[PDB]
Amino acid sequence: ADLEDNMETLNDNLKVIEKADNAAQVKDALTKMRAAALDAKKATPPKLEDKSPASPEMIDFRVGFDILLWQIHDALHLANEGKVKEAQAAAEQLKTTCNACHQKYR
Amino acid sequence: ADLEDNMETLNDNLKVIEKADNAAQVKDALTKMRAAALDAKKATPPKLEDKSPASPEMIDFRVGFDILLWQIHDALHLANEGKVKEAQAAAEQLKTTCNACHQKYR
Amino acid sequence: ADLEDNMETLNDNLKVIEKADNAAQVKDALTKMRAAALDAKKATPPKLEDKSPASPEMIDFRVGFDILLWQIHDALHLANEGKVKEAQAAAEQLKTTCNACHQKYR
Numbered sequence: 001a002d003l004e005d006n007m008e009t010l011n012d013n014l015k016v017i018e019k020a021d022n023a024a025q026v027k028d029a030l031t032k033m034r035a036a037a038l039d040a041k042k043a044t045p046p047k048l049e050d051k052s053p054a055s056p057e058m059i060d061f062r063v064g065f066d067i068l069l070w071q072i073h074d075a076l077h078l079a080n081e082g083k084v085k086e087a088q089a090a091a092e093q094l095k096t097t098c099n100a101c102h103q104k105y106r
Numbered sequence: 107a108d109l110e111d112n113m114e115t116l117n118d119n120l121k122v123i124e125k126a127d128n129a130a131q132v133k134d135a136l137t138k139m140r141a142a143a144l145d146a147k148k149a150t151p152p153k154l155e156d157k158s159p160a161s162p163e164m165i166d167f168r169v170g171f172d173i174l175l176w177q178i179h180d181a182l183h184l185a186n187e188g189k190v191k192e193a194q195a196a197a198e199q200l201k202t203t204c205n206a207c208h209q210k211y212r
Numbered sequence: 213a214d215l216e217d218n219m220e221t222l223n224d225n226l227k228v229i230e231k232a233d234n235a236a237q238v239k240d241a242l243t244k245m246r247a248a249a250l251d252a253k254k255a256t257p258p259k260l261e262d263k264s265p266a267s268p269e270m271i272d273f274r275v276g277f278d279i280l281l282w283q284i285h286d287a288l289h290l291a292n293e294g295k296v297k298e299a300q301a302a303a304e305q306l307k308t309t310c311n312a313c314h315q316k317y318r
């Protein structure tokens with residue numbers, strides 16, 4: 001999918017997690033977010049389509065998704081353990097990473 | 107190692123996992139696959155040798171291995187928990203990613 | 213932060229882990245190492261400032277941190293399970309990657 005579609009997936013599933021009641025919903029949502037973040041890594045944001053995909057900004061863009069992926073990893077492990085409230089708290093910490101990339105490249 | 111040898115390692119250890127009896131065999135094989143996937147990420151596949159190193163195709167190639175590595179991650183955790191058949195099923199799900207990359211770059 | 217600051221964080225926290233007596237010391241140190249390794253991925257080392265940003269050497273540099281991150285991952289899970297000596301042995305295994313990257317690019 002393209003970048004905006006992956007962002008919609010990330011946003012949709014983050015809201016599923018906030019409102020979630022059971023670990024299965026959270027595990028499923030974080031799994032879709034992991035796939036969306038990996039797919040987004042291969043995109044070029046519109047404010048960067050004017051650089052080499054190897055520019056330092058583009059590498060900063062892709063590493064931003066690696067940072068997001070390690071945070072999703074921590075949350076998905078909590079969801080796998082059934083720690084539903086802790087997983088929701090780890091998922092809320094994602095938005096710092098969301099906000100930092102948006103400030104630079106959105 | 108070269109890309110050919112890493113692909114041999116991936117394929118051979120995938121077979122080892124299918125025939126495995128115990129979790130230590132699955133854990134050992136998956137750990138070798140993780141190392142091979144990381145090493146493969148450094149390669150330029152023959153289909154892309156005559157394109158720019160800064161091409162979006164090279165980025166998509168490397169992200170293909172990130173996708174594989176996160177699926178290897180899930181299987182390896184199952185093996186570390188002693189869940190042999192679940193780890194084996196998670197490893198069989200690698201083949202979707204193997205083939206998706208092959209359709210593009212093999 | 214710049215590359216040298218990230219290296220100082222990696223080096224300082226590896227020493228903390230070697231001297232740690234409890235799992236919380238190790239968990240906190242590895243968590244800072246993970247953040248530093250991800251940040252270092254954005255850098256261009258002085259020895260490679262003359263290379264194209266997507267050159268095989270720059271790719272090798274960035275994948276070296278991916279290798280480091282998966283080893284940090286294993287050590288951090290062991291620390292989270294309270295296996296302190298095991299987590300310390302896993303962190304000692306990081307040095308092979310530190311030394312291999314320095315041999316090539318420092």
Ligand code: HEC
Pocket residue numbers: 003004005007008010011014045046060061062063064065068094095097098099101102105106
């Ligand atoms: C960079 C590393 C990013 C991270 C991490 C996240 N987002 Fe993002 N997002 C990014 C860009 C460059 C853009 C602009 C895309 C464009 O074509 O304009 C976006 C966009 C969004 C949007 C709006 C989508 C749209 O249709 O316009 C949303 C709702 C969004 N992003 C949400 C979001 C969430 C919830 C994130 C973390 C969980 C997140 N983004 C991370 C770049 C990056």
Ligand code: HEC
Pocket residue numbers: 109110111113114116117120151152167168169170171174200201203204205207208211212
């Ligand atoms: C891209 C991101 C790939 C992923 C994921 C996997 N493979 Fe692959 N493979 C890829 C390429 C570009 C090539 C051609 C290499 C060449 O030099 O020709 C291959 C090749 C193979 C082969 C046969 C080639 C050989 O080793 O001589 C096998 C058996 C193979 N690949 C297996 C394999 C498996 C089992 C994978 C998933 C677990 C897998 N590959 C993923 C690119 C990519």
Ligand code: HEC
Pocket residue numbers: 215216219220222223226257258272273274275276277280306307309310311313314317318
């Ligand atoms: C490449 C993939 C590297 C890995 C993995 C590690 N390091 Fe590193 N380190 C790297 C470079 C290119 C440099 C040179 C930076 C420069 O500007 O000269 C370094 C440097 C260091 C230093 C010295 C920092 C300074 O004050 O100049 C230290 C103390 C250091 N690195 C430690 C270190 C440790 C402990 C690592 C593993 C945990 C490690 N590095 C990995 C490249 C890479």
Ligand SMILES: [Fe+2]
Pocket residue numbers: 073077179183285289
């Ligand atoms: Fe994990």
